[PDB]
Amino acid sequence: AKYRCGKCWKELDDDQLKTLPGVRCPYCGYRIIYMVRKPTVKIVKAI
Amino acid sequence: MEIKVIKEEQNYLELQIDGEEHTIGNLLKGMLLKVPGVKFAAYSLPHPLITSITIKILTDGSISAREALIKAIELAENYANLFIDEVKKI
Amino acid sequence: IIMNKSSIERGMYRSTFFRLYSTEEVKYPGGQEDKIITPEAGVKGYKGK
Amino acid sequence: MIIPIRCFTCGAVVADKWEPFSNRVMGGEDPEKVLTELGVNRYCCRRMLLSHVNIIREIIHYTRPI
Amino acid sequence: PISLIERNGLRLRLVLENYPLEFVNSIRRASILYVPVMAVDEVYFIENNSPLYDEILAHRLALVPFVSDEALEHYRPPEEGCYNRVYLDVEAKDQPLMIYSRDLKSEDQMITPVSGAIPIVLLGSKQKISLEARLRLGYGKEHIKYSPVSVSIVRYYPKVTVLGNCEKAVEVCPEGVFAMENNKLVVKNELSCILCEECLKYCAGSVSIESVENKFILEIESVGSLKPERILIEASKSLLRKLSELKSKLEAGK
Numbered sequence: 001a002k003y004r005c006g007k008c009w010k011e012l013d014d015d016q017l018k019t020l021p022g023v024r025c026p027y028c029g030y031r032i033i034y035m036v037r038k039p040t041v042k043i044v045k046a047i
Numbered sequence: 048m049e050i051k052v053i054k055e056e057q058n059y060l061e062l063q064i065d066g067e068e069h070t071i072g073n074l075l076k077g078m079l080l081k082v083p084g085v086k087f088a089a090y091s092l093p094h095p096l097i098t099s100i101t102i103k104i105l106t107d108g109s110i111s112a113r114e115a116l117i118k119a120i121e122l123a124e125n126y127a128n129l130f131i132d133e134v135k136k137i
Numbered sequence: 138i139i140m141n142k143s144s145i146e147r148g149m150y151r152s153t154f155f156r157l158y159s160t161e162e163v164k165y166p167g168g169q170e171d172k173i174i175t176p177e178a179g180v181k182g183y184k185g186k
Numbered sequence: 187m188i189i190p191i192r193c194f195t196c197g198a199v200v201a202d203k204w205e206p207f208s209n210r211v212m213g214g215e216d217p218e219k220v221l222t223e224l225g226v227n228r229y230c231c232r233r234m235l236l237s238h239v240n241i242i243r244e245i246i247h248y249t250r251p252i
Numbered sequence: 253p254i255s256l257i258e259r260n261g262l263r264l265r266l267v268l269e270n271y272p273l274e275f276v277n278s279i280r281r282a283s284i285l286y287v288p289v290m291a292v293d294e295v296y297f298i299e300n301n302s303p304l305y306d307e308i309l310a311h312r313l314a315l316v317p318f319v320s321d322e323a324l325e326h327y328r329p330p331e332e333g334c335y336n337r338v339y340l341d342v343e344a345k346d347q348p349l350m351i352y353s354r355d356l357k358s359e360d361q362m363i364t365p366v367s368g369a370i371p372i373v374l375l376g377s378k379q380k381i382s383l384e385a386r387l388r389l390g391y392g393k394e395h396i397k398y399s400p401v402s403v404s405i406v407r408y409y410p411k412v413t414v415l416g417n418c419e420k421a422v423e424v425c426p427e428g429v430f431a432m433e434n435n436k437l438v439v440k441n442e443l444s445c446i447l448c449e450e451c452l453k454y455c456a457g458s459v460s461i462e463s464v465e466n467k468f469i470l471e472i473e474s475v476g477s478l479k480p481e482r483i484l485i486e487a488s489k490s491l492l493r494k495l496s497e498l499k500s501k502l503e504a505g506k
């Protein structure tokens with residue numbers, strides 16, 4: 001369950017194994033994180 | 048392409064072709080109007096959402112409607128072969 | 138009106154519609170009582186695996 | 187947002203003509219001559235090149251982290 | 253008979269002398285529809301941070317034309333299982349990067365995009381994109397991305413004659429069918445007429461316009477996927493296949 005720190009655009013990355021009070025990234029105090037795209041191949045038919 | 052026959056007779060025929068758009072129907076209508084003996088030939092697209100045409104042929108009785116359709120197909124094939132031969136030399 | 142379907146197939150008026158679903162893990166009076174966000178195993182009202 | 191690959195009316199590629207047309211029009215040349223000598227004579231393609239916004243330049247700043 | 257008018261880049265204009273209008277229209281319709289052209293069918297996205305979503309990018313890749321003159325015989329038509337593969341794997345570093353169609357690596361070297369100047373997408377800072385597209389032959393009936401011609405025209409053969417000298421006809425007619433040389437009204441491009449009848453409307457007695465029954469003008473503009481002559485030949489071949497199959501079914505029914 002990897003995450004991404006929302007500071008600027010796609011600031012580094014986070015792992016759920018990292019434990020901090022509340023929701024924060026260790027790198028900066030920004031309070032917003034996002035889930036990353038899962039590393040799986042996706043079939044997208046071109047209509 | 049599926050084919051279905053309706054109201055077939057010696058001089059009158061109706062025939063539904065599934066899978067052909069306006070192109071084949073118009074080609075066949077032109078060749079049917081070209082072949083002698085055919086009193087009235089016309090295709091129709093009953094619904095544009097469905098890709099299936101209906102060809103109605105009425106003949107004077109000298110030749111069968113199915114034979115008239117076959118002659119029209121032969122004429123169209125001759126035209127296509129001539130067109131290929133003339134384009135290749137161009 | 139009649140619209141060219143070939144134009145539509147080239148992206149003439151293709152659009153995207155975005156819908157948002159949001160929740161809050163609200164805490165209500167009690168002993169450390171919270172609505173923890175977690176996948177469900179065997180609790181009541183279970184929709185189906 | 188980004189210029190379409192092909193003209194909507196006729197399936198003619200106009201995406202590759204965006205950069206030359208835009209660069210030369212921004213340089214100080216009237217769009218008519220640039221379009222005529224670029225290789226687009228049908229006005230269906232001209233409206234594709236003329237009426238474009240290039241939103242994608244602004245969006246790359248506001249991109250979903252995903 | 254077929255007479256070439258002008259053969260420009262990706263454009264072909266012919267005059268057909270003895271062919272019914274129905275056959276010529278069927279030829280143009282089959283050129284748009286029933287000629288197979290290689291194009292992207294499915295896209296596999298390993299990673300996508302681009303501003304464009306997955307479906308938008310897949311559509312843009314599908315609309316990109318690939319040269320497939322030698323791919324018709326080496327690849328099975330869709331009615332028959334052999335698909336080409338094209339890779340796109342790039343990443344920006346610190347500045348926006350507009351990635352074009354030239355950096356579309358293909359498994360088969362003969363199959364490449366028509367032009368390398370086609371801009372696929374623009375990437376922001378530190379944005380990586382990686383995908384594999386599976387190209388497949390297909391007809392224009394299934395989708396318009398498979399059409400080999402951007403435009404196909406079938407129009408009547410014009411016969412325009414000047415009867416006396418008229419100064420208005422040179423400026424009335426939208427086409428350059430009329431010219432005024434040495435104070436005489438003459439026709440420069442007779443075959444450029446479109447039978448608009450403005451030339452006849454403002455000066456009725458000075459000019460006579462008619463259409464030639466047997467002759468027609470057939471124009472096709474390719475997109476680079478195929479040669480125009482090959483497009484016409486393939487359209488005629490598809491018409492022949494359809495007619496032969498219909499004849500076989502009619503004979504079987506009898």
Ligand code: F3S
Pocket residue numbers: 410412425426427429444445446447448449450451452461
């Ligand atoms: S373009 Fe041509 S034939 Fe008649 S009215 Fe206009 S002249």
Ligand SMILES: [Zn+2]
Pocket residue numbers: 005006007011012025026027028029030
């Ligand atoms: Zn951070």
Ligand SMILES: [Zn+2]
Pocket residue numbers: 193194195196197198228229230231232
């Ligand atoms: Zn156009």
